[PDB]
Amino acid sequence: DYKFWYTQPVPKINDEFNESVNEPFISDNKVEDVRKDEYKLPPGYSWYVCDVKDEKDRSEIYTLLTDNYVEDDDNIFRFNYSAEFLLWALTSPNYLKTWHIGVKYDASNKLIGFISAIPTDICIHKRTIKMAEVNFLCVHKTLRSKRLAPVLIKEITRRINLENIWQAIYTAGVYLPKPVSDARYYHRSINVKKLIEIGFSSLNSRLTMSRAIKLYRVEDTLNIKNMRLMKKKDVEGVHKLLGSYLEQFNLYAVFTKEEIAHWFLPIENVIYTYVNEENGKIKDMISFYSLPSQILGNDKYSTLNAAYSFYNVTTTATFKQLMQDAILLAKRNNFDVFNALEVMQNKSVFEDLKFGEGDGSLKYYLYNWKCASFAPAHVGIVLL
Ligand SMILES: CCCCCCCCCCCCCC(=O)SCCNC(=O)CCNC(=O)[C@H](O)C(C)(C)COP(=O)(O)OP(=O)(O)OC[C@H]1O[C@@H](n2cnc3c(N)ncnc32)[C@H](O)[C@@H]1OP(=O)(O)O
Ligand SMILES: Cc1c(CCOc2cccnc2-c2ccnc(N3CCNCC3)c2)c(C(=O)NCC(=O)O)nn1C
Ligand SMILES: [Cl-]
Ligand SMILES: [Cl-]
Ligand SMILES: [Cl-]
Ligand SMILES: [Cl-]
Ligand SMILES: [Cl-]
Ligand SMILES: [Cl-]
Ligand SMILES: [Cl-]
Ligand SMILES: [Cl-]
Ligand SMILES: [Cl-]
Ligand SMILES: [Cl-]
Ligand SMILES: [Cl-]
Ligand SMILES: [Cl-]
Ligand SMILES: [Cl-]
């Protein structure tokens, strides 16, 4: 079908471009020609600009997502982003409040739809372009398949265009026209009994309960003994270490110093970053963020508390040793499982460190940009 997406500046499902192509579908755009009127909504619905710095507006978004956002392929789990997490993810440097858009049902004054974007500098095939990073598209379950999502997309495109920005980046679990890369996800069990009780991990005659507990047990000693929580004094060094690491990839964000402080300085129950400092220099770093999933229907446990691999760089140890420490630090902060995508160098440690393959993949997309696609080991960016 793709009745909507084939009207947009994106590749068709069979399009394929070679390395000589790296440019927009539509160039020479003028801000003056962008529509000045908001898109029409059905009778009884209105646009609403959300202020995520206000606790009440932030809680309205939280409630919408907790009840209606992404579920796994089998409808066992639903993401449960915390309200503090949403604050962090949506207030990066130079964010625009008018790019946090909602749709209200006027008769009850309830939020039933949402989409957001934040500005970012993206390097694709060595070209750096100012882009919007789009996320948290959600329509209330009672209003699905009514073609409301295309309206949310067109309205946010209009508002991004009004700022003279014409490219975007986004990720989704569903296959749309057309991914630039596609990355399976993997899991590493930490709380073995909990994962068994909820029916996610499986046992058999070879892998009994006691053997599984033994298999996934980790030693409580760090390979990099001076790993410690990142502080404001570490921003400059993390900026240099991560910047140098990311330049090898075909797709990655170009961070400013201010952006490094926002995305990595630790926040309890949201973002964790550890560093190894030697001779005044940051030589190694580990980071992971907190994203629990609701266990739908379970009356014993509210959530599975997962840590998600963010950005990890090592110069004094092997990558296997570094990610072994990452798992231990997640365990020390009481996380139940450590999740990761097959981007950057992550695939090289999955077998040895006893990760298990998931049942789906995350696709990476660009809007109004045509280029060759690439394997996910060349992806160097993680969206939230
Ligand atoms: C330069 C600036 C540009 C900025 C804009 C950049 C583009 C941004 C695009 C968005 C980036 C978002 C990044 C994230 O947040 S990805 C996570 C998305 N959210 C969820 O999965 C939560 C649970 N599900 C829902 O809330 C609804 O099912 C959604 C809202 C997903 C669709 O609602 P509904 O189920 O009620 O359907 P409809 O009848 O209204 O509309 C049908 C059309 O929608 C196309 N569809 C389905 N799923 C997605 C999807 N995940 N990305 C893009 N398009 C999608 C579908 O192919 C069809 O098009 P076509 O096949 O007819 O052509
Ligand atoms: C789909 C899902 C998963 C599968 C894990 O999916 C990932 C694993 C690692 C990284 N990313 C993803 C992922 C998959 C689909 N969409 C996204 N998005 C949407 C678009 N914006 C960015 C984020 C991310 C889990 C889960 O892991 N439970 C813990 C356990 O089973 O152990 N719970 N649910 C609801
Ligand atoms: Cl085609
Ligand atoms: Cl103009
Ligand atoms: Cl309207
Ligand atoms: Cl709701
Ligand atoms: Cl559903
Ligand atoms: Cl239209
Ligand atoms: Cl068996
Ligand atoms: Cl400090
Ligand atoms: Cl719980
Ligand atoms: Cl390898
Ligand atoms: Cl596996
Ligand atoms: Cl490739
Ligand atoms: Cl790969």
Residue numbers in the entry: 27 to 410
From the paper:
NMT cotranslationally transfers the myristate moiety of myristoyl-coenzyme A (MyrCoA) to Gly2 of protein substrates after removal of the N-terminal methionine.17−19P. vivax and P. falciparum express a single NMT protein, whereas human cells express two closely related isotypes, HsNMT1 and HsNMT2.20PvNMT and PfNMT have more than 80% shared identity, while the human orthologs are only about 40% identical in sequence to PvNMT and PfNMT. The inhibitor binding site is located within the peptide binding cleft formed by the N- and C-terminal domains.
Strikingly, however, replacing the morpholine with acetate caused an increase in selectivity for a pyridine core (9c) and a sharp decrease for a phenyl core (8c). The electron density, however, is weak for the tail group extension of 9c and indicates multiple conformations. Two copies of 9c were built into each active site. Of these, two consistent conformers (observed in more than one chain) have the amide carbonyl directed either toward the side chain of Asn365 or that of Ser319. The carboxylate does not appear to form hydrogen bonds with the protein. In the presence of the 9c dynamics, the His213 side chain adopts both inwardly and outwardly pointing rotamers (A and B, respectively), but considering all three asymmetric unit copies, samples the B state with higher occupancy.
